[PDB]
């Protein structure tokens, strides 16, 4: 039609001059395709490899939730394991990865003759109530860690008698409890146990013998670094919770010195961050620093350990007539019969789950971030110099979303004063970075903020986030 015809083409395209060009062009295409395929393999080979995951355990992936007094956790009505069964929904909402149950064995007094570890107190339920909790917890991916300290109703944690009988009954206790199905153990106040290093080695030996995913935690009241490192010379997978981070915090420089000097001393092993073995944060900090500290413990390289009520800022100093060793959790304003009417709208769990400005909302947002990003889970931690009273550090694993946390512990506002030439070139801070959340509400989120002229407010923490560069 518009073009030439078949006969005209055959007369003009059958002669030499066209059959050569199309054959030459066909060869050129085939050479190019192989040239592209060879070029791709060159680029693939001359490319950096991707780093390998470190095969995390079940306690590397989130915080732990210590509960001391099961009776006071619910208050009245329910005071056994069956009472806790209905409250696992709240803990699952908190995105915790473990439960350090309080002692449950029948302990009467300092008499060791009838103090045994292999049966549960009648007030806490029985075996069928205990075991039903474990599998129900598994259905929610919640691990249960059983505490066992032979003397908790008295002033001495391990009696004033010898240590032979308590050790052998504790050894028999584990053999029973691993068969029961518990996912770990905890012992508190080991400084009252003679030569605790040897027994801890045996307990770690036996517990890890049953399985590789088991845990053992030890608690101490000492804050001296040399004393703390004394127990870790013979154990490598030991979680030690102590008062090292406590007894200070009025200045950010002291915390920076405490954290940095601890990590290089232990060689950047896996550690646990907690202000005390069995007491809340409010016993060591003013009411204005709970938001800042909960930001620090959820980004430091370890396994944060919290007591019950620390997500709502529960404090016994704001309510008269509350024992320091067993405060009652405030489900609502009717949970404390004594001096009624003093409980406000922000001192209840239900009074903070709908306000995106309360501690519980901040706890849940931080908890989700910790158990989601690879940088927070198993990323390297590097801290750099900053202004006076400023603590700043960066988390970065291989190439994932880098995080930047800046904390100002001072009571006066100042500039961040961030500087370069002190970080590895893999994750050098860029000119601008996104902001995820801030301790003090009032700022925007998602906008790329500048770091050269960044300003800070008293008792404020920032959680920035910048991409691979």
């Amino acid at each position: 039609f518009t073009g030439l015809s078949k006969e005209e083409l055959l007369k003009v395209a059958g002669s030499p001059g066209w059959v050569r060009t199309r054959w030459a062009l066909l060869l050129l295409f085939w050479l190019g395709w192989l040239g592209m395929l060879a070029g791709a393999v060159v680029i693939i080979v001359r490319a950096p490899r991707c780093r390998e995951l470190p095969a995390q355990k079940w306690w590397h992936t989130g915080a732990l939730y210590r509960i001391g007094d099961l009776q006071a956790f619910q208050g009245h009505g329910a005071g056994n394991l069956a009472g806790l069964k209905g409250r696992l929904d709240y803990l699952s909402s908190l995105k915790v990865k473990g439960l350090v149950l309080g002692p449950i064995h029948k302990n009467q007094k300092d008499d060791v003759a009838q103090t045994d570890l292999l049966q549960i107190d009648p007030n806490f339920g029985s075996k069928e109530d205990f075991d039903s909790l474990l599998q129900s917890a598994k259905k929610k991916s919640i691990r249960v860690i059983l505490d066992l300290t032979p003397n908790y109703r008295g002033e001495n944690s391990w009696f004033s008698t010898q240590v032979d009988t308590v050790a052998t009954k504790v050894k028999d206790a584990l053999e029973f409890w691993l068969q029961a199905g518990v996912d770990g153990f905890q012992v508190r106040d080991i400084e009252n146990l003679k030569d605790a290093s040897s027994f801890l080695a045996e307990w770690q030996n036996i517990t890890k013998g049953f399985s590789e995913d088991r845990l053992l935690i030890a608690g101490t009241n000492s804050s001296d670094l040399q004393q703390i490192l004394s127990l870790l010379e013979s154990n490598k997978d030991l979680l030690l919770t102590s008062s090292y981070l406590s007894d200070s915090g009025s200045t950010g420089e002291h915390t920076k010195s405490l954290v940095t000097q601890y990590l290089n001393a232990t060689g950047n092993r896996w550690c646990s961050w907690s202000l005390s073995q069995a007491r809340l944060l409010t016993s060591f900090l003013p009411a204005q620093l709970l938001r800042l500290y909960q930001l620090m413990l959820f980004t430091l390289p370890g396994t944060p350990v919290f007591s019950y009520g620390d997500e709502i800022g529960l404090d016994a100093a704001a309510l008269p007539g509350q024992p320091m060793e067993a405060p009652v959790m405030l489900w609502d304003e009717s949970s404390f019969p004594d001096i009624p009417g003093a409980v406000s709208a922000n001192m209840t769990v239900k009074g903070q789950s709908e306000d995106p400005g309360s501690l519980l909302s901040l706890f849940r947002r931080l908890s989700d971030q910790r158990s989601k990003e690879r940088s927070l889970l198993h990323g390297d931690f590097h801290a750099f110099s900053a202004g006076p009273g400023l603590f700043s550090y960066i988390r970065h694993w291989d190439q994932n979303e880098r995080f930047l946390v800046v904390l100002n512990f001072g009571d006066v506002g100042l500039s961040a004063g961030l500087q370069a030439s002190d970080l590895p070139a893999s994750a050098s801070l860029p000119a601008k970075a996104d902001l995820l959340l801030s301790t003090q509400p009032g700022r925007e989120e998602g906008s790329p903020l500048e770091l050269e002229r960044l300003k800070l407010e008293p008792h404020e923490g920032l959680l920035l986030r910048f991409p691979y560069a």
């Binding site: 039609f1 518009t2 073009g3 015809s5 078949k6 395709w33 791709a40 680029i43 259905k139 291989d398």
Partner: protein, 463 residues
Amino acid sequence: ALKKEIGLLSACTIIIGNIIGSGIFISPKGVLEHSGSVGLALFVWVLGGGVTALGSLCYAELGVAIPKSGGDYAYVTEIFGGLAGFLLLWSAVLIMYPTSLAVISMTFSNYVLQPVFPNCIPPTTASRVLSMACLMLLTWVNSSSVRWATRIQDMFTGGKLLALSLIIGVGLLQIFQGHFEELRPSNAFAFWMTPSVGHLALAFLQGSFAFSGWNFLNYVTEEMVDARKNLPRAIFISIPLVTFVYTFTNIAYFTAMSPQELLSSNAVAVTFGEKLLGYFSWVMPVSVALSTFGGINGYLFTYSRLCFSGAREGHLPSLLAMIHVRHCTPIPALLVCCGATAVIMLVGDTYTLINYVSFINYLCYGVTILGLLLLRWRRPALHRPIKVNLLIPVAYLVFWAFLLVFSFISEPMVCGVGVIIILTGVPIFFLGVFWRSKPKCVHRLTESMTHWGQELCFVVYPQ
């Protein structure tokens, strides 16, 4: 004549290969994002199949009514005139097809390098080069012959069927293994909702992308033996199998793990394979690449037959619609499609362009349904050996209207830009066809270029 050798099995394999592509390995995350719940996400996958079946019935009736080639475009051209037909051809050639081809090729390249870097993303240049290499190989094998293309399509359809059957069996084995804690009516609706608007618009518009391409068999006609019987049979057979495969594949995707793990992982298939097989899990991702390699061909086989039939009627430059003596294949048409797919590749992140193609292949599906409805009344004397009961075009029309209105409110900027892009082809129409008796400088140049391409590619013009 081009050829008449495509049997029932070949047409059925064409439909399956066009439907089963990169959608099933990419969509299930997104449909689980906006829906929020497993049940509501499965609702989209089970209702899109019904909507596609209704459209397929309507298209089968319309295609047996009008035997002209180039379906979806001949019907509109005949009914609404030249202008609507040219607009549909312009949108299909420039928007629907190259974007789908680019997405399919990029998915192939990204999933074929998964074992090499199974903790991060591969370099972009290597992915682009691999995708261009497979595009060039497939366009060459399409320009070489048609029997080879059909055989390749059949083998790759068998391969996709085998891979999907293996996935369905692995997911099913948990009924005997007792791992059905998900989809348990106890948990069932694990989540309720979060917004208070029509966010389901961009969940249907993103889940009905694995269903794209069910109308493409109508493009390859005048190459089908006994089109009056084989085409409706293939259309009626293909869709139920696709729906049954897709629903159960989604069931297996949500049964082996938690919704969050789809909401974080970018390798939806790879996570399933590595969890339910552990070692020897390298088999499934390669098959996925194999699966995706069955899509590109199924596109280039039909795309070339569209731009062919779109140039005989003068809506496209005369240099196309070329027939090559010694194994007739539309060589310059195939080169044009390959190049058009390649130019898109210079712009990345076309996974955000799924909304583009999914909007456009709703507009030019409602338009054809409206054309069928108009022709049902205006010309009732046509011979229709296979007839569809009414109310199917009406139901598809009301659903179409609802999806358009609710998808034009959520994100208006990109949809408006796309509408402007498809509408600015009218000046091209006026300059090309409506304007005639041009100066000799136009005809002489056009004839010289056509003759040069003719001598280069060794073709003949059917006319």
